[PDB]
Amino acid sequence: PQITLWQRPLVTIKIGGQLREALLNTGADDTVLEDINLPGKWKPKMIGGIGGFIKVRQYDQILIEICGKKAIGTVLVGPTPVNIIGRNMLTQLGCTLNF
Amino acid sequence: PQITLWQRPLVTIKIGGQLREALLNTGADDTVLEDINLPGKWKPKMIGGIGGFIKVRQYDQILIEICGKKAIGTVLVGPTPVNIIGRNMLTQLGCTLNF
């Protein structure tokens, strides 16, 4: 779908049987989710944004279904105010900016 | 132009005679710059993101030029790690997400 930026670009994701909403975020390198519970091994990693730095759990090779189109990749789990779909997933959706 | 997202989406912008680079950020409501200096009055305002809050200066009705296309509106000035073109400006550049 094409989508304007007059309202926050929120999409519906399915990740590990859980339904969540997340922001399609061209201003993000990675994918970060808060209200979620993934199973298995992970490595700690530190990520930063406009207001500084948070420690998150780095899960590799995770399957997300975002708008019913699928991607696999790194998902991060930690205290992020809003769930974001970053560019590692967005490039998998063949997602572009157009102006 | 259409832009893919394998590289951080950086554009060159002209603001107040100053040339800068800035990320096109669909995950941002506002436009925030660090290394700029604007003239005139401003209101104090606080914004947040990954890591909490930064205190910024709100300048109103500021002309910005990105990819040589013009837009006018609120530009925020404060301690942001990288320059960011938010949705208040992107809607004006008729910028869309396609996926």
Binding site: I50 | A28, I47, G49
Partner: peptide
């Protein structure tokens, strides 16, 4: 509501 995110 400005969610920049890089990893440094």
């Amino acid at each position: 509501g400005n969610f920049l995110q890089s990893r440094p």
